[PDB]
């Protein structure tokens, strides 16, 4: 769920950057400020793309910085509830699988893999369904639906995404293709 935001803000350009073109300078200050955070309303802040406009610089007594108002474009990404997503399995654990979807990972628990009885096979590091011999392993590609999101901190790592593949049209791509009109061979 990528988004493009257009934002207006007030930037402080420090004295040490006075030889720099204002827009260039503002762009840097805005990157140091905003990139690398999870914004609770907007999501992962991936990039300050550019500065469209920058106002005339204002100077305040007691400070050699110049203050401007700027308008810029921001790339963000958000995990939305019930959103359909696609990704790669990047970690196997006994309780489930992390899927890259992809600036963050999404957890699919072992009970939310497939409409089957599923056990973890430690020897080969993979899930196998009892009746349907469907196998999920590291590096497999899937479609899933986000089922829960925990947005706590400004730090990405600490935020949590939970998903399912236990619905029609979800799962490993191989499963989905065999679910399809090979199961409408009517």
């Amino acid at each position: 769920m990528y988004k493009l935001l257009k934002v207006k803000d007030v930037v402080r350009i420090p004295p040490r950057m006075f030889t720099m073109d204002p827009k260039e300078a503002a762009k840097i200050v805005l990157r140091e400020t905003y990139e690398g955070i999870y914004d609770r309303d907007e999501g992962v802040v991936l990039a300050i793309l550019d500065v469209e406009e920058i106002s005339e610089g204002v100077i305040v007594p007691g400070d050699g910085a110049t203050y401007h108002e700027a308008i810029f474009n921001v790339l963000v990404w958000e995990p939305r509830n019930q959103e359909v997503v696609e990704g790669e399995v990047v970690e196997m654990m006994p309780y489930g699988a992390f899927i890259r979807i992809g600036p963050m990972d999404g957890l699919v628990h072992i009970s939310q893999l497939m409409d089957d009885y599923v056990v973890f096979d430690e020897k080969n590091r993979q899930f196998i369904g009892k009746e349907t011999n469907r196998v999920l392993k590291l590096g497999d590609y899937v479609r899933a639906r986000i089922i829960g999101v925990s947005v706590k901190s400004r730090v990405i790592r600490e935020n949590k995404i939970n998903m399912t593949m236990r619905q029609p049209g979800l799962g490993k791509f191989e499963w989905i293709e065999k679910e399809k009109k090979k199961a409408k061979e009517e």
């Binding site: 769920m1 990528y2 988004k3 493009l4 935001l5 257009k6 934002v7 207006k8 803000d9 007030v10 720099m20 840097i28 990157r31 140091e32 905003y34 990139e35 690398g36 914004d39 309303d41 907007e42 992962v44 802040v45 991936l46 990039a47 793309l49 308008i71 810029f72 921001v74 790339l75 963000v76 990404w77 019930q82 959103e83 359909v84 696609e86 990704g87 790669e88 890259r100 979807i101 992809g102 600036p103 963050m104 479609r143 639906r145 990405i156 619905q167 029609p168 049209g169 979800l170 679910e179 399809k180 009109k181």
Partner: protein, 122 residues
């Protein structure tokens, strides 16, 4: 909130985001601060490289066309439709299952046919 006020927002495809992420990356080449992309942004870049199924320009065009096809296809749904590239009725079902309105078989085939162009061929 980012900044003082949000003035405008758009839902964007993975393909469009791939282009922007590569731009950000190539800006570094930035010398004085270099300015590396933080870890998850680089991760996002990789994901987007793998999962952008269309070129940047055909993604946009398909997004616009899907939007002009029905009132119940807004910009978010069109961007999702482009990212996923649904092949049949089942794919359309899961995309719209949690949405406001559920496409009948026929309107589903209209979408699939529009998306049947643009499909990579390669």
């Amino acid at each position: 909130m980012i900044g003082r006020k949000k003035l405008e927002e758009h839902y964007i495809t993975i393909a469009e985001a791939k282009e922007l992420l590569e731009r950000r990356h190539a800006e570094g080449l930035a010398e004085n601060p270099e300015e590396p992309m933080f870890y998850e942004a680089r991760v996002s870049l990789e994901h987007a490289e793998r999962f952008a199924k269309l070129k940047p320009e055909q993604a946009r065009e398909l997004k616009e066309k899907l939007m002009g096809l029905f009132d119940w296809i807004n910009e978010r749904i069109a961007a999702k439709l482009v990212d996923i590239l649904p092949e049949d009725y089942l794919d359309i079902r899961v995309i719209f299952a949690k949405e406001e309105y559920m496409p009948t078989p026929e309107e589903a085939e209209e979408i699939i046919k529009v998306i049947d162009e643009y499909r990579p061929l390669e």
